[PDB]
Structures are given as structure tokens and as C-alpha cells.
Amino acid sequence: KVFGRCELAAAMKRHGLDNYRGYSLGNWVCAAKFESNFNTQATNRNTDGSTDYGILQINSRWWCNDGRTPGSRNLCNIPCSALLSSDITASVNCAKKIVSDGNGMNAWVAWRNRCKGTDVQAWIRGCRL
């Protein structure tokens, strides 16, 4: 499903992304915005046999198993299909594991270019939460 901005913000807060390892809610909202426009069903095929799945476009080359990707490391130990759910539980958990690496949110190129070092709080300002 496609979330409303504030709706996703509240959901992400419920799922404990606000201030997770230092990253304020805004960062994740902004990231979701540029990666999939808040669409849980968003997918993107790459030149290799990998696809980006979910609201945070998590790549199947390293993070999930789609049962048909050459070199599946399945870092998140999860079926890529879980990342397309209307329930964001799986996408958040995997994002938390990804961000637990040293590079933090830099794993998301879109976040670096469009959110890193900005007034990210703007992405949640106005929302009733």
C-alpha cells in the first residue's frame, strides 16, 4: 500500500525508528519519500539479478532472499516478499540491521544525496504525533 507522509511517520515512530542509533525520524521519512514515495509495493530491477524491494528499496543482492538471485547473502535473513507487505515490520527491522553497520544510513544513496545534512525534521513537522 501507499502511505500518507504523516501516516508513515507515525508508523515509523511506532516501529522505533525515531532516534534509532542517533537518526531522527525525519531522516527515515525523507529516505522513504525519495526511495519509493511511501509505497510498500515498490520494486526496481537492476542490471544484475537483483531487485530493490519495499518502502526503503532494500536490494536483494545482499539483504533478502527472493529465491532467484545469484549470490544471495540474505543479510537480513528474510524473504524479499516480506519487504512488500502493507505491514512495515520487516522493512524496518532490516533497515535497522543495515543501519547498524558502520556506514549507517549512507547505505541509501538517495538518502545521502537528498536527505543527509538537511532540515530533515521538516519531513515530520506538521504531523500530529
Epitope: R14, L75, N77, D101
Partner: antibody
Amino acid sequence: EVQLQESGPSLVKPSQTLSLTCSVTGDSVTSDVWSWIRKFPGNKLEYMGYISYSGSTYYHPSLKSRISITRDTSKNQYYLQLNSVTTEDTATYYCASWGGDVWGAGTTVTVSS
Amino acid sequence: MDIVLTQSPATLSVTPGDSVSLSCRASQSISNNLHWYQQKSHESPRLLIKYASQSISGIPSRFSGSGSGTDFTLSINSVETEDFGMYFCQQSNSWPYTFGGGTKLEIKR
């Protein structure tokens, strides 16, 4: 099924170095984030640190200085190194997945002269 | 700065069949980033609930977790004979990760 197993010297002398090995079976060491957790007497647990899929690491600040976590991709093991130990480092040591789903049986390391 | 987790009661004595609730409080808000572990004598810790209330496929249904922020609760609907031992909470919201002092679940007689 993924399984872990700790191994190493059960006795370390003060000022010396404590070394432990965690053998990963069932999956690849490069395919997950792995940790070292120690349990002091009196049920006091301390999350020592973890090494990610890339090889990057995070160490507990109180330990930062004496700790080192590494891995060996061909052997499928990751290690713990703790320098200048003192009787205070006597504890039961466990290796576990970052996700917390798999834990080794744990091994006791005693620091004494 | 390091987040401190306080668990209570330190010890709890119950009869198999009774239900119980264990508390874990954080010195700083941690949202849902609180995990519950069980460790019985001579055994390694076992993850029971992750992220405050998410269940783990394979963990008995009598175990459940609730709470958010700084107050969390592990509930056991009708404790069973194999459920006695230590219970610890751990937060993964900020590094370093930290554990509460644990609560001992013991047999009432």
C-alpha cells in the same frame, strides 16, 4: 541450521591476552553480523561488541582500547581478542548472531596467576 | 550516557499455571528497541520477544511483550514447569547495547 561454538584457552594470566574463537556452521560468516557477549558473576551481562557483514566493528566503550573482533572467511570463524586482562575479565563468554537467534553454548575464561 | 535498564522484581516465586508480568525500565526512551531473553541454568540465553512486542516463530505463545519508550513488560500466560530461570531485557537503540540486571523466576512451595 545455523550453529555457533566457542573455543579457546580457559585460563589467562593477568596482563596477558584473552583469545576466543567462534566457529560458524550452517551459514557463512560473511553473511551476517556477529557478536560477543560476556556474563560476569552475579548475572551481569555485557555486550562486548560486534562485527558486521563488511568487516566493520563496534566496541563497547568501557572495553574500547583492549578489544578486537576479527573474522576468517575461509575458516568461517570470527574471533575475540581482549588485552591487559585482570581478574575482572573472568566470565562466561558467548558468541551470538546480532539478531540474537543463535548463541554458542558459551565458554568460561578465568583470569588468574 | 550509557542507557541503564532496571528490571523488577529482582526475584519472583510462582506456581506453574500462574501468569506473571516482568518489568524492565529504561533510563532514556528507546521506543520499541527492547528485547527479552530467557536463560536457564547451565544454558545459553534464548531470545523470546524482539522489539518490545514482536513474536518469534517457534517461541511458545504463552510469552508476549508490551510497552514502549521507557516502560516494558514481558508477560507469561500460565507459567510452565520448564519456564523457571533468569529473564533479561536488552536495548539496541543506542550503542553500547546494554542489559538489565535480570529477574529470577523461581518455584513457589
